[PDB]
Amino acid sequence: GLTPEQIIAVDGAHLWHPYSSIGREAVSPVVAVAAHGAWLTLIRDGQPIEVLDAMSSWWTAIHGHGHPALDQALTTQLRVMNHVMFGGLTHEPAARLAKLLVDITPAGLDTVFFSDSGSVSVEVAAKMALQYWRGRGLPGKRRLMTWRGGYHGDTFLAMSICDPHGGMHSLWTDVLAAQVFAPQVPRDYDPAYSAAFEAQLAQHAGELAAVVVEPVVQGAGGMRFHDPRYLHDLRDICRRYEVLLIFDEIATGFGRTGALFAADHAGVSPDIMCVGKALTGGYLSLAATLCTADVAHTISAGAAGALMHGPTFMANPLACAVSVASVELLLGQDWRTRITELAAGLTAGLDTARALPAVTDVRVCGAIGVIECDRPVDLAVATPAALDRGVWLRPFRNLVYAMPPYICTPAEITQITSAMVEVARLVGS
Amino acid sequence: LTPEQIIAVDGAHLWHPYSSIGREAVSPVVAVAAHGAWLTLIRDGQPIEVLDAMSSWWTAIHGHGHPALDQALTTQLRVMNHVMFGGLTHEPAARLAKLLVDITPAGLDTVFFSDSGSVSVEVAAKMALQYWRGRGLPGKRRLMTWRGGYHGDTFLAMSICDPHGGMHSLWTDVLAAQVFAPQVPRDYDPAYSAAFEAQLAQHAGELAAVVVEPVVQGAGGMRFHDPRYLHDLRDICRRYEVLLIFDEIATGFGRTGALFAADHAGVSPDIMCVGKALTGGYLSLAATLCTADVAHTISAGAAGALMHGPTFMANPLACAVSVASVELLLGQDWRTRITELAAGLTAGLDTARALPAVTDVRVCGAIGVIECDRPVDLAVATPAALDRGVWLRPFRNLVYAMPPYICTPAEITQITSAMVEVARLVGS
Ligand SMILES: *Cc1c(COP(=O)(O)O)cnc(C)c1O
Ligand SMILES: *Cc1c(COP(=O)(O)O)cnc(C)c1O
Ligand SMILES: NC(=O)c1ccc(-n2ccnc2)cc1
Numbered sequence: 001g002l003t004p005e006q007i008i009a010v011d012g013a014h015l016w017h018p019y020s021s022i023g024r025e026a027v028s029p030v031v032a033v034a035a036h037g038a039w040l041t042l043i044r045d046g047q048p049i050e051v052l053d054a055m056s057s058w059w060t061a062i063h064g065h066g067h068p069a070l071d072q073a074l075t076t077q078l079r080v081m082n083h084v085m086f087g088g089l090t091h092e093p094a095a096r097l098a099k100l101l102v103d104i105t106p107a108g109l110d111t112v113f114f115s116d117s118g119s120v121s122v123e124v125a126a127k128m129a130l131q132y133w134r135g136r137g138l139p140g141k142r143r144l145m146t147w148r149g150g151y152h153g154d155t156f157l158a159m160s161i162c163d164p165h166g167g168m169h170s171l172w173t174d175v176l177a178a179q180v181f182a183p184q185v186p187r188d189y190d191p192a193y194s195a196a197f198e199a200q201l202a203q204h205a206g207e208l209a210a211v212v213v214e215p216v217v218q219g220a221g222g223m224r225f226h227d228p229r230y231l232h233d234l235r236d237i238c239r240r241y242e243v244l245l246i247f248d249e250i251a252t253g254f255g256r257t258g259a260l261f262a263a264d265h266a267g268v269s270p271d272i273m274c275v276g277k278a279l280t281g282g283y284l285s286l287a288a289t290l291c292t293a294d295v296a297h298t299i300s301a302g303a304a305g306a307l308m309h310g311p312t313f314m315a316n317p318l319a320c321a322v323s324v325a326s327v328e329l330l331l332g333q334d335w336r337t338r339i340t341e342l343a344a345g346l347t348a349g350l351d352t353a354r355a356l357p358a359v360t361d362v363r364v365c366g367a368i369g370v371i372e373c374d375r376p377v378d379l380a381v382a383t384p385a386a387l388d389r390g391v392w393l394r395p396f397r398n399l400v401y402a403m404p405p406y407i408c409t410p411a412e413i414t415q416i417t418s419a420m421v422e423v424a425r426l427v428g429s
Numbered sequence: 430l431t432p433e434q435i436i437a438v439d440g441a442h443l444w445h446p447y448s449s450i451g452r453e454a455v456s457p458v459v460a461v462a463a464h465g466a467w468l469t470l471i472r473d474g475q476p477i478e479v480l481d482a483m484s485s486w487w488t489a490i491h492g493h494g495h496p497a498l499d500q501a502l503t504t505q506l507r508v509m510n511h512v513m514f515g516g517l518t519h520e521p522a523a524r525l526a527k528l529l530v531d532i533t534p535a536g537l538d539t540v541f542f543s544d545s546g547s548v549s550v551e552v553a554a555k556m557a558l559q560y561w562r563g564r565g566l567p568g569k570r571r572l573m574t575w576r577g578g579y580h581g582d583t584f585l586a587m588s589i590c591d592p593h594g595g596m597h598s599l600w601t602d603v604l605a606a607q608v609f610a611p612q613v614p615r616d617y618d619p620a621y622s623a624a625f626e627a628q629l630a631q632h633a634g635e636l637a638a639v640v641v642e643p644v645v646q647g648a649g650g651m652r653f654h655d656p657r658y659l660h661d662l663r664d665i666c667r668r669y670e671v672l673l674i675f676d677e678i679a680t681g682f683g684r685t686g687a688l689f690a691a692d693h694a695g696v697s698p699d700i701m702c703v704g705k706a707l708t709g710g711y712l713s714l715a716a717t718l719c720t721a722d723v724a725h726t727i728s729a730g731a732a733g734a735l736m737h738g739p740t741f742m743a744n745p746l747a748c749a750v751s752v753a754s755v756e757l758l759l760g761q762d763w764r765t766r767i768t769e770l771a772a773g774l775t776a777g778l779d780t781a782r783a784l785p786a787v788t789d790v791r792v793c794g795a796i797g798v799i800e801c802d803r804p805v806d807l808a809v810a811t812p813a814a815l816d817r818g819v820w821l822r823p824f825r826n827l828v829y830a831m832p833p834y835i836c837t838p839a840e841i842t843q844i845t846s847a848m849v850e851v852a853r854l855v856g857s
């Protein structure tokens with residue numbers, strides 16, 4: 001047992017945080033001591049205060065924390081089977097979840113590879129793509145193509161298709177695989193962008209295993225939105241030039257952008273798909289990589305005869321069980337109307353931010369609200385400003401944004417947006 | 430779902446480790462329960478109890494459904510399932526970090542939590558690369574290892590896997606080109622270390638780190654080597670200014686008879702990875718530890734930070750059960766437990782040495798191995814072990830076990846008896 005002060009002491013000495021230092025943090029992390037529904041209990045000046053989890057804990061907590069149905073699913077599975085190895089054994093949570101995911105994902109994604117994080121699921125997607133073309137007798141097709149502004153995770157192959165600036169590739173000279181980057185995909189649909197992307201792809205087609213993109217929304221690379229019709233064009237380009245299409249839906253999946261999956265906005269299916277973050281409703285790490293029967297059969301028929309990947313905790317019963325509950329909970333309600341209301345709430349509440357001196361854009365897509373500023377947002381100022389108003393917000397770069405739990409009431413959304421609106425005001429000092 | 434329905438869904442839709450879709454020689458066996466050292470599996474439509482001789486791929490050190498670990502999970506579930514580690518910290522992460530810093534080899538002062546072993550290896554490599562960039566030596570960017578190793582399945586991890594065992598022939602022009610020393614021998618041979626140093630000497634200016642599994646190499650072949658080699662590696666790495674990384678994802682938390690396999694040599698690496706048994710086999714979790722000097726150098730470098738951050742970094746539920754698992758291990762006489770387990774394996778596997786198809790029998794802590802003279806046919810071996818009440822999963826030419834620490838002497842003998850009969854059948 002440790003007090004908040006003791007936690008801070010241990011943390012500062014011994015704990016790495018995401019993209020952080022040891023010993024050079026400008027501000028200490030804030031101690032979290034509970035989470036329930038849409039609210040975190042955090043320690044501020046020795047006192048526990050409840051604040052809205054406007055970030056959904058990095059996109060994960062779509063049903064809120066400690067949802068009784070999700071809690072119950074975990075405890076139920078715990079009493080029967082915590083985990084067995086997936087080498088040579090199978091089980092009901094894996095079967096149930098696989099059945100669900102093949103049913104609700106874009107058409108044609110018939111096989112499911114479970115892994116333990118988004119970054120791994122992306123490396124598995126790349127491995128599927130490369131083994132596929134090797135199974136077609138085309139080992140030269142081994143490079144990846146993407147558009148700038150993207151984020152696909154933190155492992156070294158995942159890093160190679162991250163935005164070169166966002167991903168700090170200048171720090172990684174001579175270390176990463178050299179991939180093919182198209183320019184930043186624009187917000188508004190412009191057929192010339194797609195025509196250009198096609199011409200670039202065409203000259204590399206004999207080298208390319210796959211195009212890998214985030215559909216409709218680019219998350220960690222800048223919270224940018226693009227017209228779904230671009231995805232339609234990619235599916236077409238990939239089809240005609242024989243390059244696989246991979247959609248990374250680790251941030252966009254399970255309703256977040258107003259469709260069940262963001263691909264559904266465009267009405268197209270990728271050859272391979274990754275899901276992750278919200279898969280377990282934010283309870284546990286789990287990810288999945290889906291692919292078509294053709295991809296699966298070609299890999300399996302190749303000289304290698306198998307997909308050469310197998311995580312230790314592949315298809316963990318506990319994580320699978322809570323995911324099944326989380327997916328069913330989403331599907332068992334009018335989620336489409338819920339997200340529409342949230343999007344309306346976000347738009348209404350963020351509207352006055354457009355007139356602010358430091359704001360360059362306000363944009364909303366489903367349960368995603370963004371205020372883009374003209375300068376970097378000072379965390380040392382923004383974080384306590386939002387906490388003062390009962391909201392946990394984590395800006396990055398020039399972005400004040402939120403992806404709130406789907407269970408947030410209108411009053412809660414009013415609270416979140418007011419805090420966001422106030423944070424941007426302080427930005428414009 | 431019924432077992433038959435599970436099998437039908439599984440065949441149509443589920444990938445398994447290193448498997449095909451639609452071309453599996455045998456269906457997987459449906460598991461419907463696990464308690465203690467025992468799995469309940471469906472065989473010919475009927476449930477059977479069998480020993481989890483594999484500890485579910487080396488994870489279940491305390492067995493399944495242990496009341497202390499079950500309750501740690503449900504206690505944490507009541508308070509806080511998870512919060513983002515960006516900007517927040519919490520009690521389970523601090524408790525686990527404190528524990529890990531205290532029990533790992535001396536000097537490992539900082540802890541980076543991630544969700545799997547492969548990722549923890551990638552994080553280790555990132556630490557080493559950012560370290561040398563922080564020292565103004567970005568040329569130090571390659572890795573050196575010895576053959577026979579396994580470090581995970583993500584693409585940097587694959588680059589230090591044994592080139593034959595990791596099927597590098599099938600990844601031509603795709604993987605980072607690393608430096609490989611020959612297979613480390615079982616017995617200590619000064620000439621091997623001398624040659625290792627000579628090879629490293631030729632590449633020192635471009636090497637960020639030596640990365641090895643200490644004492645036991647797992648998935649690459651269940652090979653044991655003399656701990657004195659680790660002493661030599663530490664020495665070589667210090668003199669040539671190359672970081673030393675130990676991958677203890679399979680060897681950690683008592684499995685080789687010491688708390689960490691490094692302890693067999695008294696050696697501290699600069700960076701260390703742990704996983705598989707960290708949560709007692711409940712949930713995916715892994716950790717990468719590094720020294721204060723590595724942490725400070727990265728932190729004072731151009732990036733000013735380690736450029737990595739998993740979504741579920743330091744997940745409160747996984748951390749909470751890991752705290753419980755580690756405390757449960759430390760709070761008992763685990764050294765005597767593993768010694769007794771090793772003696773049981775040694776005694777039980779002895780008659781295998783005489784079998785016509787057996788080339789070696791070897792035991793290291795709670796690891797017992799029969800090495801055969803041919804690849805073991807799973808279609809024969811799995812049901813032969815199930816017929817004797819044991820879940821055994823051979824790979825390559827190896828019939829082996831890494832049993833839960835809670836196995837009784839009678840259960841260990843039941844496991845070794847099954848292993849012997851499997852080895853007998855291999856020679857048939
Ligand atoms: C968060 C994210 C990832 C990586 O997931 P981790 O679980 O943090 O490794 C990959 N791709 C996208 C689009 C993401 O948003
Ligand atoms: C199992 C293992 C890994 C990989 O861990 P995953 O959790 O399967 O990614 C890495 N290194 C060693 C030594 C292992 O035994
Ligand atoms: N590297 C391997 O060949 C391997 C094999 C089996 C597994 N595995 C994981 C869970 N069950 C089997 C993991 C890795």
Ligand SMILES: NC(=O)c1ccc(-n2ccnc2)cc1
Binds near residue numbers: 739742
């Ligand atoms: N879990 C987190 O809170 C977190 C924060 C930042 C990131 N991040 C930042 C840049 N790239 C990833 C990832 C995870």
Ligand SMILES: [Mg+2]
Binds near residue numbers: 039
């Ligand atoms: Mg409240």
